[PDB]
Paper text:
To determine how LCDV1-VILP effects antagonism of hIGF1R, we performed cryo-electron microscopy (cryoEM) imaging of an [name] ectodomain construct IGF1Rzip prepared in the presence of a 30-fold stoichiometric ratio of scLCDV1-VILP (∼30-fold molar excess calculated per receptor αβ monomer). The initial reconstruction was readily interpretable, displaying a pseudo-two-fold symmetric arrangement of IGF1Rzip domains, with each L1-CR + αCT′ module engaging a scLCDV1-VILP moiety. Further ‘non-uniform’ refinement (NU-refinement) in cryoPARC (v3.2) led to a final map with improved resolution (GS-FSC 0.143 ca 4.6 Å), sufficient to permit unambiguous placement of the scLCDV1-VILP moieties and the domains of the receptor. Whereas the resolution varied significantly across the map (local resolution: min 2.4 Å, median 6.8 Å, 75th percentile 8.4 Å), highest resolution was achieved at one scLCDV-1 VILP binding site, permitting conservative morphing of an AlphaFold236 (AF2) model of scLCDV1-VILP to fit the density. Within our atomic model, the structural changes within each receptor monomer upon scLCDV1-VILP binding are seen to be considerably less marked than those induced by [name]-1 binding to the [name]-1R ectodomain. The L1 domain is displaced from its apo location adjacent to domain FnIII-2’ by only ∼13 Å, compared to ∼42 Å in the [name]-1 bound case. Also, although difficult to quantify due to heterogeneity in the relative disposition of domains FnIII-3 and FnIII-3′, the points of membrane entry are judged here to be approximately 90 Å apart, based on a linear extrapolation from domains FnIII-1 and FnIII-1′. Instead, the scLCDV1-VILP bound to domain L1 makes a sparse contact with domain FnIII-1′ in the vicinity of residue His539′.
[name] virus-1 ([name]-1) and several other Iridoviridae encode viral insulin/[name]-1 like peptides (VILPs) with high homology to human insulin and IGFs. Here we show that while single-chain (sc) and double-chain (dc) LCDV1-VILPs have very low affinity for the insulin receptor, scLCDV1-VILP has high affinity for [name] where it can antagonize human [name]-1 signaling, without altering insulin signaling. The binding of [name]-1 to the [name]-1 receptor (or insulin to IR) then leads to a conformational change that permits the receptor “legs” to come together, enabling transphosphorylation of the intracellular tyrosine kinase domains and activation of the receptor.
Author numbering:
A (entry chain D), D (entry chain C): 1 to 62
B (entry chain F): 1 to 35, 41 to 153, 162 to 189, 193 to 256, 265 to 509, 518 to 624, 683 to 705, 745 to 798
C (entry chain E): 1 to 35, 41 to 153, 162 to 189, 193 to 256, 264 to 509, 518 to 624, 684 to 705, 745 to 798
């Protein structure tokens, strides 16, 4: 478990490979205004030169 | 059938079935990471943006949404109303019914099989075509963009316009918002028309929509909801609540407004800083990074406890000050532990009240510990502070002068509240270089490269102390300069005559540059009294007197027409002053290191060893802002000398710079 | 007539008269700042350098020293034997008899009227012609270098050679040190000759000179004085302490590593250790408050005074004080280390083995330390010796240093029962010391090319309630001199749930054959905040990954000095990964024929907002030692592939390295 | 008092003017040992200035 630097398709592929069948979450609720809040998530961290660990990949992914 | 307020379909291909009944999507739409045939002719309008990302198997957008006509883009995804990114197997944008995109731009990227990009005239579908981003797709040279109709000018070319290989790009006549075939729609209409120029026969309403009518402004008893329709007062009383303000129904009152009591459906204008309470479920908010402090952005009162533990970080003083600079009242306690990056707590400016609802063990409201670089608190004689209840504990803070925290409890009001061990000089102020008197500067004289600065004579506290001075100066772009870091140091002795005061002349300085200068005294005490005093001066910022600016760089000239000459250039190398304007002149022309460096060091050895002490007229115009200008009214095919000068704010007294000149000939008549 | 030991003529023009009798000038010669006709045909030899600077009125050097022949330059002026600088009115170097300058170079500079610079072949007058400096004189293109003789090649040109407009540059024939006209001098002679090949008829002797004879080495009862003559024992018995006779030379002071013998103070006896500097300072107590202050104690063996070390801040201090005070062995008075907040150990005082106590601090104290905030150990380890003759020892407010260390000190010191009960107290000393901390004893280490598995014993906290965690500090250390305070990569591993397995950590991504410094620290979160906290820590363990396949050889170059032969050379590999044993070379016959930046940030926002987590045959030979080899028996003018491998001591099991190959063709037959 | 940084040829001339009749000269002639150098030369004194005072030049003057 190391902080792999994953970017572009490789970042998504890493998320796709780590999650596999897990994927991500798609429930439609009614949406409150300005619920977009939340920045600098682990997905951004993986692309950075520091990268994100496979555990961090699991944390941001399913 | 309205669907919203946001659709996010991903992973499962079959989850796309949630669009079987939706004709309008209220909010955004997300189709990501999708890995058969699904058709949704019901959907026509999307209020917000549309996002597609890594959908395998899909070849064209017309397979899913053939009837999609308007993407209003009421809220944008990074200023984009439609994002098609990393879409594999995708061949074309099959949205042949798309007519109007109201707000945002488009970003189509990384689609190695996507065709028909240049075949779509986006200038008639959206407005901000300049801010679009279509990079990284399949190359049109390797596609085969073929139509089975009309055409217009795309960029500098004129060619046919088609969405797919069966459907063209539909357009309205120049007489009109039109129907299927040549009949203009209603002015309040948008896209297509079930019937011409009728309010109740519009696929999508521009402005707003209510009761089947495209209305410009909402009816009197209705309010703006989202950005396309109007709802009544009882509707937003059921959304979970929302406020009614400025004829609009938003989730929360805008900045500078607060909810009215009892009548909590309207916002009352609060004049001062409205009580922006930030309430977090965790008892003690730990700020261990700049990212963690982000949640405290814009807070005025903090219902909780603050635990600052910042070891590493970025430019922090300006960052926390963005988030926590507005915090004024802390209900609980504040603990600054292991915050080695902090040299000062100045990022907590408006913090003027610390209550103490919860206090650390031993009844402590302010608790600092192990801050190796904390030179000073935010307690300077300008800020106010009040700790209502609790004590203060200071330990293992070596760069913090102990006198600074004694000054704190005066404003704090807890002078005799702490114990004897709460403040300990042993681990606090350990390596301190403070506790000194004040050296006062006397006069400063500035030239383009020299600075003369003198300070008052300093009598040492003891008669026997031998006194000397040290001048610390360095180039500082701005004022946030600390004494511990850079500094150029020169030792000047006290002059023998007591009538002249000590000074120093600095030589070799950049013109128009702000320098940070401060003087420290060298008190060699013969009687080693551990009551060390020393003397230190204030940080004085001095900028060189502006010199004459440099010549403009890279003067290039051309002639696009007779009697006209276009000239462009670069700013000078050494502005030596705030650039104000350029002065250009054109005159008609009649028809036909180591070496000097090595000498330096050798030189010094000589003196260091010889001497021994006894024991056509010019036309002139000023370009105000840009580095480009066009000259008019010239003799065709005649040579011209182009002199260009560069002035600054003080060029009124110093005089403008020299001329970097060029020669250019106009176009033949 | 010998004149010396140095002539400095300046100011007065008539002060030049001091050269009226001198035929040889022992030492240097200065003619400075001089503003009629003076001739000195007597002078012929100059031992040291000759300096001329700003002499007004002089037109040529031939006017003063016509017979100047040899400038020995025994001691140089900035590596120059002859300096002509800022000579006004000077037109040429009239030294037409100058023959040999033995050691230094020439610097002629800033003489706007000086000619005949290129007309002088300095290659036959001096040796280091490359290090000359002739800049800033009158340009040869604007002078007129004219002769009234012989010539040779100067640089790439061949042209006449003359000193002035009347005298040429004299040269000896190719058969020979010659006389005025074609007769070779004596081998021990130099310059010109009053008579051919005679010892007593020489203007200047090479090597040495004695009793009118050019002798190679001094007679048995004579010694070298300066660098040109020999003198007897009684002569240097009269020079002024006096001069020493050593290695057949008569110098001013004994060279480094020698001291004067007692009684017989005319000879130097070899002292084996650091010969006693014996440093005496007028101030009673030398205070070392900076690395600059300690400079005056450089190279001292015995210090007549007191030492007060008060070093708050500083640079790399341990290695610097060790350079200055590392040779001090005996201190007559007392030693006080107060506030010395940078010192973690007193190891910089190595050779210090004796402290007397002539003057003692109030209370009869010879060793007095206080407020040593970060001083963890003395220089008292079981290797060093120490003896305090008189006085007591006081230790106070010394947190990091363990009290057991100072108990061990007085065993060697010899003052076990001399101090009082308050002189050594355990309250403010050893208070928060971590030397007493229980070791996190390592249990096993397993090493691969890039992975290291290391485990330590399970640690039961001193209290039952303490929550225990671990932290692994590891970093690449080229050698062992590694301190815990600096670099360190830190990984927090928790105590395993099962009590049968011991805590460990797996390191991944390490450089093969690299020594890593590893130590583990325990995280004991005490529920009961007992101020008797020491924590736990482990020893610095140095682990080098298992020797992995070595690196490829560096910079393989090949050439062909003959047909059927190929010479190849290379460099050792970058990462040998073990002890180099031999190289394996192979030769095979070859057959005859902002935007991208802006996209970056925008990209990250997309991912940061979309995804969401769930809640011919080869011939082979081995080169044994060197990095060079010659291949024999090859087809002439045939291309060859040269594979070179690098094995080590463990290449028998892990295999030799890869190949850095090159192609070379042999010489044609 | 404040004096212009003086180096190269001008420095020599300035010294001559100040010294005048006094001039500059070595107090001990023909000393057996060199007094040494490398620091505290008027080259350093006026090229990087602590104040090239007239009195300082006078001390150089002999």
């Amino acid at each position: 478990i190391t902080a792999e630097i994953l970017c572009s398709a490789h970042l998504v592929a890493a998320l796709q490979r780590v999650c596999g069948n897990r994927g991500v979450y798609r429930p439609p609720p009614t949406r409150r205004r300005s619920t977009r809040n939340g920045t600098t998530g682990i997905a951004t961290k993986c692309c950075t030169t520091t990268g994100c660990t496979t555990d961090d990949l699991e944390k941001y992914c399913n | 059938e309205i669907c919203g307020p946001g659709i996010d379909i991903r992973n499962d291909y079959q989850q796309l079935k949630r669009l079987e009944n939706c004709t309008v999507i209220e909010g955004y739409l997300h189709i990501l990471l999708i890995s058969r045939s699904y058709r949704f002719p019901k959907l026509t309008v999307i209020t917000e943006y549309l996002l597609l990302f890594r959908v395998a198997g899909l070849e064209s957008l017309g397979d899913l949404f053939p009837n999609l006509t308007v993407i209003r883009g009421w809220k944008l995804f990074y200023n984009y109303a439609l994002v098609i990114f990393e879409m594999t197997n995708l061949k074309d944008i099959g949205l042949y019914n798309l007519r109007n995109i109201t707000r945002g731009a488009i970003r189509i990227e990384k689609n190695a099989d996507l065709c028909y990009l240049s075949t779509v005239d986006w200038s008639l579908i959206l407005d901000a075509v300049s801010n679009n981003y279509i990079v990284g797709n399949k190359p049109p040279k390797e596609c085969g963009d073929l139509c089975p109709c009309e055409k217009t000018t795309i960029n500098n070319e004129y060619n046919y316009r088609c969405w797919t290989t069966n459907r063209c790009q539909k357009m309205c006549p120049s007489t009109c918002a039109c129907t299927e075939n040549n009949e203009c729609c209603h002015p309040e209409c948008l896209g297509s028309c079930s019937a011409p120029d009728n309010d109740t026969a519009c696929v999508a309403c521009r402005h707003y929509y209510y009761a089947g009518v495209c209305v410009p402004a909402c009816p009197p008893n209705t309010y703006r909801f989202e950005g396309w329709r109007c709802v009544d007062r009882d509707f937003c009383a059921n959304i979970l609540g929302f406020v009614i303000h400025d004829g609009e129904c938003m989730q929360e009152c805008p900045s500078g407004f607060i909810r009215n009591g009892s009548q909590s459906m309207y916002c009352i204008p609060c004049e001062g800083p409205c009580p922006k309470v930030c309430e977090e479920e965790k008892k003690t908010k730990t700020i261990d990074s700049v990212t963690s402090a982000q949640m405290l952005q814009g807070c005025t009162i903090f219902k909780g406890n603050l635990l600052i533990n910042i070891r590493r970080g970025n430019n922090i003083a300006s960052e926390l000050e963005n988030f926590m600079g507005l915090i004024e009242v802390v209900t609980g306690y504040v603990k600054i532990r292991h915050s080695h990056a902090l040299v000062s707590l100045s990022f907590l400016k408006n913090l003027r009240l610390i209550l103490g609802e919860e206090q650390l063990e031993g009844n402590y409201s302010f608790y600092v510990l192990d801050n190796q670089n904390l030179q000073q608190l935010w307690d300077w004689d300008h800020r106010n502070l009040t700790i209502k209840a609790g004590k203060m504990y200071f330990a293992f803070n070596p760069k913090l002068c102990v006198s600074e925290i004694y000054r704190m409890e005066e404003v704090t009001g807890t002078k005799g509240r702490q114990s004897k061990g709460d403040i300990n000089t042993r681990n606090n102020g350990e390596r301190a270089s403070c506790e000194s008197d004040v050296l006062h500067f006397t006069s400063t004289t500035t030239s383009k490269n020299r600075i003369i600065i003198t300070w008052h004579r300093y009598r040492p506290p003891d008669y026997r102390d031998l006194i000397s001075f040290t001048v610390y100066y360095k180039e500082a772009p701005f004022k946030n300069v600390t004494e511990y870091d850079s500094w150029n140091m020169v030792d000047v002795d006290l002059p023998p005559n007591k009538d002249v005061e000590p000074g120093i002349l600095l030589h070799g300085l950049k013109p128009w540059t702000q320098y940070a200068v401060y003087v420290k005294a060298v008190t060699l005490t013969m009687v080693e009294n551990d009551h060390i005093r020393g003397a230190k001066s204030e940080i004085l910022y001095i900028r060189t007197n502006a010199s004459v600016p440099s010549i403009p760089l890279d003067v290039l000239s051309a002639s696009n027409s007779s009697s006209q000459l276009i000239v462009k250039w670069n700013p000078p190398s050494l502005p030596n002053g705030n650039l104000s304007y350029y002065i250009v002149r054109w005159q008609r022309q009649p028809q036909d290191k180591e070496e000097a460096e090595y000498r330096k060091v050798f030189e010094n050895f000589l003196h260091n060893s010889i001497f021994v002490p006894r024991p056509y007229p010019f036309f002139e115009s000023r370009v105000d802002n840009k580095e480009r200008t066009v000259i008019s009214n010239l003799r065709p095919f005649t040579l011209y000398r182009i002199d260009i000068h560069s002035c600054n704010h003080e060029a009124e007294k110093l005089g403008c710079s020299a001329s970097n000149f060029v020669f250019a000939r106009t176009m033949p008549a």
